Amino acid sequence: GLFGAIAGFIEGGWQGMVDGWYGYHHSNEQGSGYAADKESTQKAIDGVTNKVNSIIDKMNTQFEAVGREFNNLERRIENLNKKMEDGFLDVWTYNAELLVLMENERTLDFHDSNVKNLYDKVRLQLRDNAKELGNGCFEFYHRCDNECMESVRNGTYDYPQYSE
Amino acid sequence: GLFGAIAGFIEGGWQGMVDGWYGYHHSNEQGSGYAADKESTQKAIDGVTNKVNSIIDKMNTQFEAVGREFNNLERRIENLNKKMEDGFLDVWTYNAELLVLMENERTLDFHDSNVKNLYDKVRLQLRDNAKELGNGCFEFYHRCDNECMESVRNGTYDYPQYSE
Amino acid sequence: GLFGAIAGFIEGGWQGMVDGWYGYHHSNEQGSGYAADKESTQKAIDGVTNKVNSIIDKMNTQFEAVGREFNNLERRIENLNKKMEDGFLDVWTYNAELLVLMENERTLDFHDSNVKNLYDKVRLQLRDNAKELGNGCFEFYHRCDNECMESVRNGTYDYPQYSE
Amino acid sequence: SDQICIGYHANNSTEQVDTIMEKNVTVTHAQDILEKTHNGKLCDLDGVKPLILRDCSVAGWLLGNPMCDEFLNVPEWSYIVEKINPVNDLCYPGNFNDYEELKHLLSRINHFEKIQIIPKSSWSDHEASSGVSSACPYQGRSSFFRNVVWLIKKNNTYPTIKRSYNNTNQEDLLVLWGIHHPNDAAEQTRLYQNPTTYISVGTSTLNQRLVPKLATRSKVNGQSGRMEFFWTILKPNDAINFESNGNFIAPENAYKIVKKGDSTIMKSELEYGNCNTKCQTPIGAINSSMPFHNIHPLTIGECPKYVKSNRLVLATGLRNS
Amino acid sequence: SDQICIGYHANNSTEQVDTIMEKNVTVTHAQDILEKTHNGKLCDLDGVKPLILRDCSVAGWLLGNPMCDEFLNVPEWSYIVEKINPVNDLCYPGNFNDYEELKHLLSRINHFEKIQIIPKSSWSDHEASSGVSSACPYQGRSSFFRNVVWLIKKNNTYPTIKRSYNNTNQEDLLVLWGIHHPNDAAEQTRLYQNPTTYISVGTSTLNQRLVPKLATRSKVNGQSGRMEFFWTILKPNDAINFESNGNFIAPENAYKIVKKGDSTIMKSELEYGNCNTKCQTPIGAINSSMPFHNIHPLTIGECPKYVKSNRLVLATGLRNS
Amino acid sequence: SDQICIGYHANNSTEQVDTIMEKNVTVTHAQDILEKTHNGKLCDLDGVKPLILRDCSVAGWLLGNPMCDEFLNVPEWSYIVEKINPVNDLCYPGNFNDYEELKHLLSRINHFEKIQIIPKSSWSDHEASSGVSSACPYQGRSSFFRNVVWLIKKNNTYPTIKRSYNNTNQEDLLVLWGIHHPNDAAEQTRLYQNPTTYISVGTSTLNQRLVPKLATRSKVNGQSGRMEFFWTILKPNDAINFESNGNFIAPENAYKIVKKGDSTIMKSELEYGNCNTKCQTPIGAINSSMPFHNIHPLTIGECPKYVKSNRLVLATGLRNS
Numbered sequence A, B, C: 001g002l003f004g005a006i007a008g009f010i011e012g013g014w015q016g017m018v019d020g021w022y023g024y025h026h027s028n029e030q031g032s033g034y035a036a037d038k039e040s041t042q043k044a045i046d047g048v049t050n051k052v053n054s055i056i057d058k059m060n061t062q063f064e065a066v067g068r069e070f071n072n073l074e075r076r077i078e079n080l081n082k083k084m085e086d087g088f089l090d091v092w093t094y095n096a097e098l099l100v101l102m103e104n105e106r107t108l109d110f111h112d113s114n115v116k117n118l119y120d121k122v123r124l125q126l127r128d129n130a131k132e133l134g135n136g137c138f139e140f141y142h143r144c145d146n147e148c149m150e151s152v153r154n155g156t157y158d159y160p161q162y163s164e
Numbered sequence D, E, F: 001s002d003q004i005c006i007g008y009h010a011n012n013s014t015e016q017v018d019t020i021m022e023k024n025v026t027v028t029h030a031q032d033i034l035e036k037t038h039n040g041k042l043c044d045l046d047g048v049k050p051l052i053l054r055d056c057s058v059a060g061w062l063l064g065n066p067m068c069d070e071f072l073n074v075p076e077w078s079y080i081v082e083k084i085n086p087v088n089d090l091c092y093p094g095n096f097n098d099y100e101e102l103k104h105l106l107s108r109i110n111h112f113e114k115i116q117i118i119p120k121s122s123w124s125d126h127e128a129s130s131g132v133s134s135a136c137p138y139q140g141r142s143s144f145f146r147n148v149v150w151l152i153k154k155n156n157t158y159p160t161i162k163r164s165y166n167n168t169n170q171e172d173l174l175v176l177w178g179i180h181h182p183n184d185a186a187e188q189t190r191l192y193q194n195p196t197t198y199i200s201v202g203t204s205t206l207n208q209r210l211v212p213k214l215a216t217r218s219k220v221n222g223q224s225g226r227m228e229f230f231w232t233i234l235k236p237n238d239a240i241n242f243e244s245n246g247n248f249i250a251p252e253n254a255y256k257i258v259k260k261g262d263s264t265i266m267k268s269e270l271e272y273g274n275c276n277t278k279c280q281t282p283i284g285a286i287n288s289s290m291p292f293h294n295i296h297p298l299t300i301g302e303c304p305k306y307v308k309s310n311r312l313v314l315a316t317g318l319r320n321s
């Protein structure tokens, strides 16, 4: 990826999380489980939905079709007519194929950016109070029960705590 | 944002800084104040000025206009003429609308990249000597007067100092 | 750069490394030397080779040429024919010039992304066991001989080690 | 020891997309946006049936080639379908002037009502019922184009004709007529006594004078003679004036243009499928919500945008492994 | 305890831009690049005034319809304005051959000087001053196109004409002439004694022979006759040769093409506004530095690029909240 | 103390590229993709030589202008080169009907074989060897277009001609003929006794009747008369029928179309360079692997895509300092 996260410092995807694109896996004294981050999953949904719509709508007034007849002594204008309809056909075909290639690339790197932004939302919260495992995981320097985990997930984590 | 900074780990913008796009807010024993980073504000100004100019200049040789008359038994070539002028009109209209959408997006993510690059210019200077507050701020492990702050701002900060 | 690495926190390029685009410079008890990272150099080679090929291939069915003759009382269709060939010529010229500008920019920022991703591949390996010099370098909290350096380069570095 | 991990979605999707830097990239979710499927049929366009000329051309239909009787009084159409090379065209060989311009006009028309403009009974001093040919058979016996009349001499005289028609309708009127080119002076005098003939036609806009061309030509449909046809649009309240001392193929029926609208002439060998669509092509109809298709450039109705790609797939989700 | 913060600009801007992934996005700074404003006037183009035909057509002007006397000797123009359907066109009904090709030629011309090529006094053996009509009134009394002459018989004779003109000028010369189509043999002999007439015209390039068409036509402007006009460009040093024994509408004035340059014919109902511009459209002029406008496709001068968008705004600053 | 550093490549490259946000950006590696170089010659296209008309036009070549004898029986060509304004065109002044449509046809043809279709000896009752002119000199003495014959009267009589030709070949046949327009009745009767003449021509498709136009014209190449030429494609198994009582410029040679294929007519002043190419332009040939060139829009062969840029350089490596 372009942002280093997806298939980068986070080596693989979670077949286990089905509630969203980006999320968490916690492991504490009350057990394990997956949890999707709705705030960033929904935002990414709005984004690529707008992307799809902007593509469809920008190309509604394209080039049309109409057939035209020419007699045997009108070969020049018949050829002109063919060449210009094939012309617009080619540039619109190029315009659609190129647009898809370009945006598909922005979209993949968009997801890669969202994950990296999520990892840092947590990292910038658990400052001293945890250590970077280097693989997308954070080891806690204390006990983080299910209420505490939620404080990390919804961005209300409290730093006023010791850690050693 | 794509880079995590703007409306990300830096939750909001400074209504107080009017000297530039990117800057600093310091708080020490001599008082408070805002200070714009000229090096990165000017660079960003050159960039989007070139961007605007490159857009205007790439589309100077577009499609022109000229009206043409056709009699009543020249409807085929009249229609050909209309269809080809509407044709170029549509692809140039698409080309301008699409270009704006695409570059506007690069431009927003450009600013988001500049801020993040500024936060790391400081972070990579104040290594041990400060702690990441996680919100775009750095708490010092020593006293940083107004001369010392300037050393951070202009990239001449001196690490040879204790910190505990 | 967009990713902060190239001509950023790594102030300059290595005239000394000729084996690849991205690499390492080690300095230990057995001496000094440069070493290119093949994994990331090759990947970047595949990427811009595909980029070049995708550009050449998307524009193989462009607009053609053919000359056509018109007599003195066919100036309207002669002018139509000229205007439509100049038309397609202009949009294909714009399409090639714009495409180059855009991809050249993605390509520079692609290299900037690869270097930054390389610096973090190392940083996320040497966790506690080294300190960030802030200039693209890592100072070791232990002895890293030529076999140990290789463990960093090929991604098999062993963290089970003290460091103080 | 307690810990929390940040990660991304993954599934069993094998769907790929392309990028500028990487082909065949498997992702979690994707969206196809290219329609590649058609029903292979010619359908009604929003409930209104197309006019399917069968083995008839536009010329055969409008002039009234006897083999095209099926289209004598055609109902409203959405579009017109004509074969590449219709068998029933000009039964009596010749040419139709400004035919392509007339076909073009047809693409803006949805409905004619054919009216009789000059009754066959009104030809007091000529034979209006002897103008038939083996080139134009109908049910085993010689005939002719139904909508015009091939007038000939009566009692070895062809009085010069002065006939005129005022378009008192609210509609534009499509009027057809022609001239017969014989193969020799003998045929000339035998059909129309007068050796040196002309046809003059005038309207507000038309100032025409035709004279027959005698020449030796190869037989087409068994004839070396030629019929050359002409048309005009008669504006409401305008009149058309014919004068002729021979070789005149006179109007009998004309066409009131009673519905203008967007239409087209499709070249297709397909016949009427008994379906309805919102989007038609010469090789079949399209039922789709895609923004693109790659079926055929020539299209009518509420359609997706045509493109030459055989694959267009957008990425929605992230890279899958 | 001492601290430093990194942040970005913000202000009170309500200006929005669009992106592929988000609409109506408020930013700090933006740049409009789409001109949407015009003065609604027809102006000079860089100081040089356009030729505003009023209720006159190009045919009326060039042939010299008596109602178009305003344009008898027109000064240099930047562009030409003609109404959609000028009232003063061909006062005597008929047609102008290759009219659209001539109008196209006009779009490359900035200035004529009209010169007299054949004086009216030089018609020794015909009436050069009786060719007038109620279809072409001037100040209550019958008249005719000023730049050509409708010649008729003198003393019940029409000697065949052999008149020729050498273009000794440095400029190309636009030469106009015509033929009268009467409604009957009686009118024919009464205007021009000879019953069987022709007009032949030759140059280096032109080899023309016209014969009048007699026919019964509807009255237009009170006439059932028609005048049919022709034109050619006479090259410098070339000559034009006319021969005719009747129905000849002879040249009197021709047009030296004394300035070629980029121009156009605008269809517009507007009249002359008393302004100056660098960029003109049929609905008003444009004063702008924008790279785009959405005012009208048809444009002349140093202009922005036309586009169908009703909004084009670029982002310069960053997201605002 | 032990340490490891991460860094990037650098070299002595001065090559620059442009981006949307930055011009003249020096990088380590780049790839030019715009060909800007041509050999300035006209070459064979894949080994097959072009037909280089020299000072001859297509009309001069096909009609057989005596000055164009070099092209009497031309071998297969890849493309055709014609000067902007060939000196040897229609030696006897006049015009070639539908010339541009014929030249267009030529662009789809790679080879003719000229065959004699009507032998000069077969003109029993007319003079087939007196039709020459000083407008068409050959080696100091008067001559004429070689592929058609200017027939005149014999013993002060011009019997009406009834000559016909059946195309028994497998190939389409390009047939050329003409009509002579004299300057007066005296010249008419002197060349062809009959004062009132015509030429009729028929095929399956063609129904033509020409009559000469007498007029006084300016001298071109010393002649005030005009020759007007016509052409048709005779289908295999079809016949062409000529009838004429004077002014007939009869076919002698016609052209079997024996190879169709992609071709073009290049307007160029260049002569044959003795080279071979895969891609030709009117100003020189291209040998390249680039995907783009900026040499000339008009191109034939396996070519790069034309573009108006004078620089296209892609970045491969990273920013250099």
Ligand SMILES: *[C@@H]1O[C@H](CO)[C@@H](O)[C@H](O)[C@H]1NC(C)=O
Residues within 6 Å of the ligand: D023, D024
């Ligand atoms: C991608 O996959 C398709 C079929 O799914 C295959 O035909 C093609 O070879 C692949 N493309 C590349 C670049 O390998």
Ligand SMILES: *[C@@H]1O[C@H](CO)[C@@H](O)[C@H](O)[C@H]1NC(C)=O
Residues within 6 Å of the ligand: D166, D167, D168, D237, D238, D239, E218
């Ligand atoms: C046709 O008849 C109408 C109504 O009676 C009349 O007003 C009109 O002038 C006539 N049309 C022509 C052109 O003769």
Ligand SMILES: *[C@@H]1O[C@H](CO)[C@@H](O)[C@H](O)[C@H]1NC(C)=O
Residues within 6 Å of the ligand: E023, E024
């Ligand atoms: C953005 O603002 C416009 C104008 O006020 C409003 O009509 C619309 O709801 C918004 N546009 C879109 C596409 O959401």
Ligand SMILES: *[C@@H]1O[C@H](CO)[C@@H](O)[C@H](O)[C@H]1NC(C)=O
Residues within 6 Å of the ligand: E166, E167, E168, E237, E238, E239, F218, F219
């Ligand atoms: C016109 O006149 C000039 C000399 O006055 C003469 O040289 C030229 O050839 C003439 N042109 C024609 C075609 O008569």
Ligand SMILES: *[C@@H]1O[C@H](CO)[C@@H](O)[C@H](O)[C@H]1NC(C)=O
Residues within 6 Å of the ligand: F023, F024
């Ligand atoms: C870039 O370099 C070229 C080549 O020397 C120079 O001529 C030009 O001024 C430069 N372009 C810009 C816009 O800086």
Ligand SMILES: *[C@@H]1O[C@H](CO)[C@@H](O)[C@H](O)[C@H]1NC(C)=O
Residues within 6 Å of the ligand: F155, F156, F157
């Ligand atoms: C010329 O023709 C006339 C009559 O047509 C005839 O009497 C005479 O013998 C002919 N002379 C020649 C030279 O054949």
Ligand SMILES: *[C@@H]1O[C@H](CO)[C@@H](O)[C@H](O)[C@H]1NC(C)=O
Residues within 6 Å of the ligand: D218, D219, F166, F167, F237, F238, F239
């Ligand atoms: C040409 O000749 C062939 C055989 O001689 C014959 O079958 C064919 O019908 C002829 N073409 C015409 C139109 O006479």
